[PDB]
Amino acid sequence: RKGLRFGTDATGAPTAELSVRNGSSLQLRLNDGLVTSYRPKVSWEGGDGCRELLHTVVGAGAGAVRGGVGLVLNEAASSSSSSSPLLGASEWSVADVDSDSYDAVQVELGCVASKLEVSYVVTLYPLSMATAVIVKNNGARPVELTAAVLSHIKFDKRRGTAVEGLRGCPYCSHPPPASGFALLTPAEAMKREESGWFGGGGGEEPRQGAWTVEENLYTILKKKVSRVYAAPPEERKKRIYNTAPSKFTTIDQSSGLGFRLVRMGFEDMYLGSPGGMYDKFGNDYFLCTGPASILVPVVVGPGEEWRGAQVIEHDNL
Amino acid sequence: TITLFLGATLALAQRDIKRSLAYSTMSQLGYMMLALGIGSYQAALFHLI
Amino acid sequence: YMFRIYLLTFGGYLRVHFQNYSSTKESSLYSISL
Amino acid sequence: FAFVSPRLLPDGTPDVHYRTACGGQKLRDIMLDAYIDLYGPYDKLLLNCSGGGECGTCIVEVVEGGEMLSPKNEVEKEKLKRKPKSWRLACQATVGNPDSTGQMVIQQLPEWKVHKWDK
Amino acid sequence: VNSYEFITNAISSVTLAIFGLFIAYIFYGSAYSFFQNLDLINSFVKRNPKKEFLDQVKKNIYSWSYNRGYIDIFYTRVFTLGIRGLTELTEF
Numbered sequence A: 001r002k003g004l005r006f007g008t009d010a011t012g013a014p015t016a017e018l019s020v021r022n023g024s025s026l027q028l029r030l031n032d033g034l035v036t037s038y039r040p041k042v043s044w045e046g047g048d049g050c051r052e053l054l055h056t057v058v059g060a061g062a063g064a065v066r067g068g069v070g071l072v073l074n075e076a077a078s079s080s081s082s083s084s085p086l087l088g089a090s091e092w093s094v095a096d097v098d099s100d101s102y103d104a105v106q107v108e109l110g111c112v113a114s115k116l117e118v119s120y121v122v123t124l125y126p127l128s129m130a131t132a133v134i135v136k137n138n139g140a141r142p143v144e145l146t147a148a149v150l151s152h153i154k155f156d157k158r159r160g161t162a163v164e165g166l167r168g169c170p171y172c173s174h175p176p177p178a179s180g181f182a183l184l185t186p187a188e189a190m191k192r193e194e195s196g197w198f199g200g201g202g203g204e205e206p207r208q209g210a211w212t213v214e215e216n217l218y219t220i221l222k223k224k225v226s227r228v229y230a231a232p233p234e235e236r237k238k239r240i241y242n243t244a245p246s247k248f249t250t251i252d253q254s255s256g257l258g259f260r261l262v263r264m265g266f267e268d269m270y271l272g273s274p275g276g277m278y279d280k281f282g283n284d285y286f287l288c289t290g291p292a293s294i295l296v297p298v299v300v301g302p303g304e305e306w307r308g309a310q311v312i313e314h315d316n317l
Numbered sequence B: 001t002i003t004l005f006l007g008a009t010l011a012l013a014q015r016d017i018k019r020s021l022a023y024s025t026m027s028q029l030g031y032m033m034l035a036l037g038i039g040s041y042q043a044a045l046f047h048l049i
Numbered sequence C: 001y002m003f004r005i006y007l008l009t010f011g012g013y014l015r016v017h018f019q020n021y022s023s024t025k026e027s028s029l030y031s032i033s034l
Numbered sequence D: 001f002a003f004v005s006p007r008l009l010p011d012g013t014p015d016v017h018y019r020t021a022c023g024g025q026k027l028r029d030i031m032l033d034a035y036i037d038l039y040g041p042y043d044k045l046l047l048n049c050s051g052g053g054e055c056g057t058c059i060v061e062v063v064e065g066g067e068m069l070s071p072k073n074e075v076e077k078e079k080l081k082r083k084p085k086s087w088r089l090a091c092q093a094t095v096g097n098p099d100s101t102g103q104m105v106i107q108q109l110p111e112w113k114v115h116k117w118d119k
Numbered sequence E: 001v002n003s004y005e006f007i008t009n010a011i012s013s014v015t016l017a018i019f020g021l022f023i024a025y026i027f028y029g030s031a032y033s034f035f036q037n038l039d040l041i042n043s044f045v046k047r048n049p050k051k052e053f054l055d056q057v058k059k060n061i062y063s064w065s066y067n068r069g070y071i072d073i074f075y076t077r078v079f080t081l082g083i084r085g086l087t088e089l090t091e092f
């Protein structure tokens, strides 16, 4: 194969241990876009850093029911509200790997010939991994999409786990459920997010928002604590100057680590967490959160391009 | 008990470490000056040490 | 205030570099390619 | 609606934020309405803060819509020896209450930016 | 045991000490630790009643400390501007 500063390996499926001259390394699967693990250097004493994604165990055969970054793209079918037709179950072609040094590596997957031309770019910097999508389309009529990343981060104890930095968004407490949003989960993330403990916020389709909840968020009332945090669906996202929402941040009061989740070109943020039906998915805590553009259909055009990129910085050396 | 409280309320919002330390040590010498003014200097010298 | 000083200058993210105000660590890292 | 547009805390391409504001107040309160950060890495309690005063830790850089602000004071002329003519203090500046049809673009705190490399 | 009166006096002293340390940790201390409960912090911004008044107190207190305890400016605008005119007078 080809490789400069890593090895295109195989364990059940083709993978790659993207590495840098700092210790940080991500274990990306080639069978799909589902990154499996990402080990930065968080602390100084201890040789390296270890605070990865929540990577569930192998299941049937090759398993893969793990989640963790898996890009979930779809097509907003112009037939019904069926925003879950397909990921375009097809091949995947690696191309034009580059490093530029021994502290940066990025792979470029490609998938064509059934849907439009989809390009996927996964980058690893000395600190921050990143995922970007290109959705180049042309043909009979403009087609649509959802373009969601999930990125199920791992958190410490589910009793001291929360998020800062939003504090202001319309928060659109309406979740289209069963995958967070954007069905066709990366072969698994979570299923049928519901709440039956006590009175939860939102009439399931408000924009109650006007957030003004203070510095923290205290995400503990979970298994359905999941809500798009973007601007409301055209009630204010219609006219000029429609109050761009935000960029993210995280907290875990029991370890002392931070992981900023910057979005670029996407539209929303799916802060979603378990903590209810949790004793079936491990021990400590986790939650799915990432950007996308799904709150409205995403008509792109007959010969145009889409863009979207999540970046996971930590700035916590 | 004047210089004590005055040095105390000037270390606030002073964002220069080698300056806030001086304000703090003046507010602390306030305590010694007070303690001398009541006869029980046997503890003032200990506080100074 | 004696603890204000300590908490200000010994606990935090070294506000010079913590990637919210200043970007002097890694920007020229060639995001999604041609 | 003195439509404002923030160029926030230099990021990769831009880092723009949008905000609809009814003129009449100062820049400080109108920013702290749209929740966008102004006081750099300066925290609540006492650090440089408390509005309309001395330290001058809010140095917003005005790019578009400059001909809609109050004129410069002399405290601005004093605490900004280092300034290029562009930016001001914004803690002692007001937008006109009758300018409801303005269009102003602002870049936030300088000295933590690498820009004018753009446009 | 130890003198009960001195015991209670030391208790009051350390109580004010820990109270000062606690407000300092609330305002300046970080959040990633476990000693900033942040539930209350998540409340004393939501229903903060007197923010319109409290900040003005800020607008006073800082304005004092930066002015270095105005007594400093006093000696400037009195003494080193008094002798500067007294020399001129005894010259003329």
Ligand SMILES: CCCCCCCCCCCCCCCC(=O)OC[C@H](CO[C@@H]1O[C@H](CS(=O)(=O)O)[C@@H](O)[C@H](O)[C@H]1O)OC(=O)CCCCCCCCCCCCCCC
Pocket (backbone or CB within 6 Å): E075, E079, E080, E081, E083
């Ligand atoms: C409990 C109640 C209390 C009430 C108040 C009591 C106050 C008593 C003490 C008075 C304050 C003294 C502060 C000294 C500050 C200082 O040293 O400034 C430094 C400047 C330096 O000069 C200048 O120095 C300049 C350099 S610089 O600016 O200093 O860096 C230089 O450029 C310039 O040429 C030069 O002129 O010194 C002066 O200009 C004047 C010095 C002070 C002269 C005092 C004379 C004696 C006063 C006795 C008062 C008795 C009152 C009772 C009478 C019955």
Ligand code: SF4
Pocket (backbone or CB within 6 Å): D048, D049, D050, D051, D052, D053, D054, D055, D056, D057, D058, D091
């Ligand atoms: S006015 Fe001077 S002091 Fe008051 S906030 Fe703006 S900068 Fe800080």
